Structure formats: structure tokens, C-alpha cells
Amino acid sequence: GAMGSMERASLIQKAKLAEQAERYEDMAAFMKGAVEKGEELSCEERNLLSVAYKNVVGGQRAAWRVLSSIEQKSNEEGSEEKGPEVREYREKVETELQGVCDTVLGLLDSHLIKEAGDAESRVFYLKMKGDYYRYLAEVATGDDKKRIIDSARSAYQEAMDISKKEMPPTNPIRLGLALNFSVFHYEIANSPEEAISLAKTTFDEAMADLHTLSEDSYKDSTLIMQLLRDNLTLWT
Amino acid sequence: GAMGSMERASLIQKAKLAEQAERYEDMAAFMKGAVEKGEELSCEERNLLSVAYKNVVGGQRAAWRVLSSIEQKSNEEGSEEKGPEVREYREKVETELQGVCDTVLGLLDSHLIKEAGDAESRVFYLKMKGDYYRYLAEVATGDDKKRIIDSARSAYQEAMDISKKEMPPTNPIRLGLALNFSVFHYEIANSPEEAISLAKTTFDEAMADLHTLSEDSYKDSTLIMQLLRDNLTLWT
Amino acid sequence: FPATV
Amino acid sequence: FPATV
Numbered sequence A, B: 001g002a003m004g005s006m007e008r009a010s011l012i013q014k015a016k017l018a019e020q021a022e023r024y025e026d027m028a029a030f031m032k033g034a035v036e037k038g039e040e041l042s043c044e045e046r047n048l049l050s051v052a053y054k055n056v057v058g059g060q061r062a063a064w065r066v067l068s069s070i071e072q073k074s075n076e077e078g079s080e081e082k083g084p085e086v087r088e089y090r091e092k093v094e095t096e097l098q099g100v101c102d103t104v105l106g107l108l109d110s111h112l113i114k115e116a117g118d119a120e121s122r123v124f125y126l127k128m129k130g131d132y133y134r135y136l137a138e139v140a141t142g143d144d145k146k147r148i149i150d151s152a153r154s155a156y157q158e159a160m161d162i163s164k165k166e167m168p169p170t171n172p173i174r175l176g177l178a179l180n181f182s183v184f185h186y187e188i189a190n191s192p193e194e195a196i197s198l199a200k201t202t203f204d205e206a207m208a209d210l211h212t213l214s215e216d217s218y219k220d221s222t223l224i225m226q227l228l229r230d231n232l233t234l235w236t
Numbered sequence C, D: 001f002p003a004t005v
């Protein structure tokens, strides 16, 4: 590990600097180094880890979609053959994306999930595990695609079960998990009815729990609830 | 060279795909590979080279400025000492930026400039040489800072001299060179009067030559003229 | 695309 | 910052 010689606190500090500079690749590398120190992450540190990798892989996914679209058009009736280059470059981006997903899943498996006992950490990491299997599923085609989809589903499901037992319906992690699992159902698992049902139930149960919250907790929560509503409007 | 095994035409094709995907690091690496094939670049290819590196180093410069600002505040009266980390990370970004500038200057020196005989290629590459020395000057502090500034000035000046002899006043390369040399004067060389004089003369002489142009050439040209006007408005 | 967090 | 191209 190239971060093995840097203090944990310095890695955290530099991840925050990288976030301010929108240097998400650096941010992710700093937080990988911090995780590899072997200590549990605090609430704030977990968010630095998730945001860094979400942004790295988000950019990869956007680029992959651009290239996959060009590739699909290159294979339509009437398109001039243009050689292997579009496929090759799409594959290059895809392999880099898979590498980042594998790295995140490895951090979760070694050993963030096994040491996470509190609901807010365990649900968080299992959500991330579902998310990174979902990104693998978006580009998957071969013998293991179903296993990749089922790995995403299994991680999201375990997170869901814990979240419903241990967290209030307005908890932002619980809400975000439900949002993303609903998207998994719609876009990955060919289950739009399940996606809609989950988004609606989650929204309605959160609405009914808002009265228990402070102004600041209400602000959080309502923000993710609006994303659930946005997706429902797209889907209905 | 990791691109040594790829066909020149495939590198150009992939640079265009990378541009569409906003993958500027990849775009720059493809175009470095293309330059290293040893053949001159066409007009379109020159633009792919310049846009790729402009965007890579542009992002580095933006990040450097964020970190330099944090660093300067960390060294003001009353600021809590926070250790070496801000300086270290600013230095990391700075060294990466310098590396990219050195790479571009190396391509220009080996051997793009020496083989460029037509005004539109020679001025283009000399402008780039001024630009990348200017970016080195933005972060420079040591014994060689004056030499770095003078290297930028010398490249811009040779480009200026050729542009005025060989190109119409509305030529987009001539205009962009003048825009950037004016910014060099204002931001690097502590010569705001020269910056203003150059921007104004360039604008006025281009205005007087617009009547010779087609609609499409007018559209080009007028676009860079507006940038000259924008800078003049900022400076006066 | 739909929203995720 | 001023504009460059």
C-alpha cells in the first residue's frame, strides 16, 4: 500500500482536502489507505469513503454509457464498419470500472463489514456492497451475471432487514438504501412493480415519522424523500 | 510508450471517443501516442492534442488553486497549526501538474515545433509552448522562476511575430494567441498595461477585418473577440 | 437515469 | 480568472 507510511489522521485530513478540490480519485486512495489501517471508521469517515468511490465510479459509469451507446449504434443496420476501436475503448473503461468496484468490495470484505456491529455502520456498508455489485451488474454479460445480480440483491436485502428492525423510517441511511434498492429492482432486476412498491412504502412511512424530528433531521430525510418521489414520478 | 503497439489511426479515433466521453486523461494519452508516431499532425489532430492537455492541466490548476488558498489561510495570523498535510498535498498536485506540463513541452520539443513549417501549425505549437511555460510559472517559486517566465514570453513572442506576418487579424489561432499572451502579461509578468494594450489592438484590428469573411469564419473569430472584450471589461 | 445516493 | 483558449 502506497499509503502505508502515512498517518491515519493525515489520510483523513487529505481526503477532506481532496473533497474540497473535487479530486475524487485522490480522495478514494486516501480513504482506502485509512481503511487499511485496520481501525473502524467513524460516521463522518464512512461518508468520505462512500462519496469518494461514488464519484470515481460515477464518472466511469457515465463514460461507459457514452461509449456503449456509440458501440450499439455502430452495430445497427446500415452503419459503416469502423473496426475494433469502439469496443476496445469501451472494454478499457469497463475493466477500469470493474477494478474500482472490486477494490471497494474488497475493502468491505476485508474487513469493514465483519467489524461493523452498530446498525448505522452495518447497514451503510451493506448498502455500499449492494451498490458496487449493482455497478458490476450494469456492465455484466457472462456466466456470472446472474450471480452478480444476486450478490447485489443479497447485500441490499440484509441491509434492508437490519434497517427496518434497528432504524426509524426517516433515518437517512435507511432512506438511501431503499432508494437504491428500488433502483436496483427497476433497472437491474426487471422488477418495476417491486421498485415502485418499495419507493412508495418507504416514502409514506417516512412521511408519518417526520413529526418526531428536529428541524435539522427533518431537512435531512425530506431531501432523500424527494428523490424517492422523483423516481416515482419518472416511473408512473 | 504504452501506445507504441496501437495504430496511429486507432489512437486518433480513440482520442475522439475519449473527447465525447469527457475522458481527457485518456484523450491526452492517445494523442501523445499519436504524436510519438513521428508524423506531423493535421489541423484537426492539433486541436485534439491541445484540448486534451488543456483540460487535464486545467483541472490540475483548479485543484492547485483550491489547495494553495487553504494553505495561505493556514499561514495567516491566528490560524491553528494543522501540520504538514496541506503543504504536502498541494505539493503532490503541483508535482503532477509540472509533470504534465513537462510532458507536453517535451512533445513540442521532440519534435512537433521543429517540423512545423506552415504558419498555422508553427504558431499553434509555439502558443502551446507559451501556455505550458505559463502554467509552470503559475506554481514556480525558485531560482528558475524568472527563466520559466522568460521561456513563456519567448515562445509567445515568436508565435506573435509569425502570426502578424503570416495570418490575417481574424485568424482564430492568431486571436487565441493574443488572448493568452495578454493574460500572461496581466497575471504572470506584472504588465497590466501591456495586457490591456494587446487585447485592445487585437480586438480592433480583427473588427476591421471581419468584412472579408464568410458567415462561418465570422462566427469563429467573433467568438474569441468576445473573450478579448470580456478580459478588457474585467481589467478596466 | 433515476436518482441514487 | 481571465479567459484563455
Ligand SMILES: C=CC(C)(C)OC[C@H]1O[C@H](O[C@@H]2C3=C(C(C)C)C[C@H](O)[C@]3(C)/C=C3/[C@@H](COC)CC[C@H]3[C@@H](C)[C@H]2O)[C@H](O)[C@@H](O)[C@@H]1O
Pocket (backbone or CB within 6 Å): A019, A047, A048, A050, A051, A052, A054, A124, A125, A127, A128, A172, A173, A175, A176, A177, A220, A223, A224, C005
Ligand atoms: C464527502 C462528505 C461530505 C461532502 C462532507 O458530506 C457529504 C454529505 O454527508 C451527509 O449526507 C449523507 C450523504 C448524502 C445526503 C446529501 C443525501 C449523499 C452522500 O452520497 C451520502 C454521504 C451518502 C449517503 C448514503 C451512503 O450509502 C452508503 C446513504 C444516505 C446518505 C447518508 C449517509 C446521508 O447522511 C451529510 O448529512 C450531508 O450534509 C453531506 O453533504
Ligand SMILES: C=CC(C)(C)OC[C@H]1O[C@H](O[C@@H]2C3=C(C(C)C)C[C@H](O)[C@]3(C)/C=C3/[C@@H](COC)CC[C@H]3[C@@H](C)[C@H]2O)[C@H](O)[C@@H](O)[C@@H]1O
Pocket (backbone or CB within 6 Å): B019, B047, B048, B050, B051, B052, B054, B124, B125, B127, B128, B172, B173, B175, B176, B177, B220, B223, B224, D005
Ligand atoms: C477537441 C476538439 C473539438 C471539440 C472537436 O474541437 C474543439 C474546437 O476546435 C476548433 O476551435 C478551435 C479551439 C477553440 C474555439 C472554440 C475558440 C477552443 C479550443 O481550445 C481550440 C481547439 C483551441 C484554440 C487555440 C489553440 O492554441 C494552441 C488557438 C485558438 C483556438 C483555435 C485552434 C480554434 O479554431 C473548432 O473551430 C471548434 O468548433 C471546436 O469546438
Ligand SMILES: [Mg+2]
Pocket (backbone or CB within 6 Å): A007, A008
Ligand atoms: Mg499511526
Ligand SMILES: [Mg+2]
Pocket (backbone or CB within 6 Å): A091, A094, A095
Ligand atoms: Mg469486459
Ligand SMILES: [Mg+2]
Pocket (backbone or CB within 6 Å): none
Ligand atoms: Mg415489502
Ligand SMILES: [Mg+2]
Pocket (backbone or CB within 6 Å): B007, B008
Ligand atoms: Mg502503422
Ligand SMILES: [Mg+2]
Pocket (backbone or CB within 6 Å): B091, B094, B095
Ligand atoms: Mg514544488
Ligand SMILES: [Mg+2]
Pocket (backbone or CB within 6 Å): none
Ligand atoms: Mg505592440
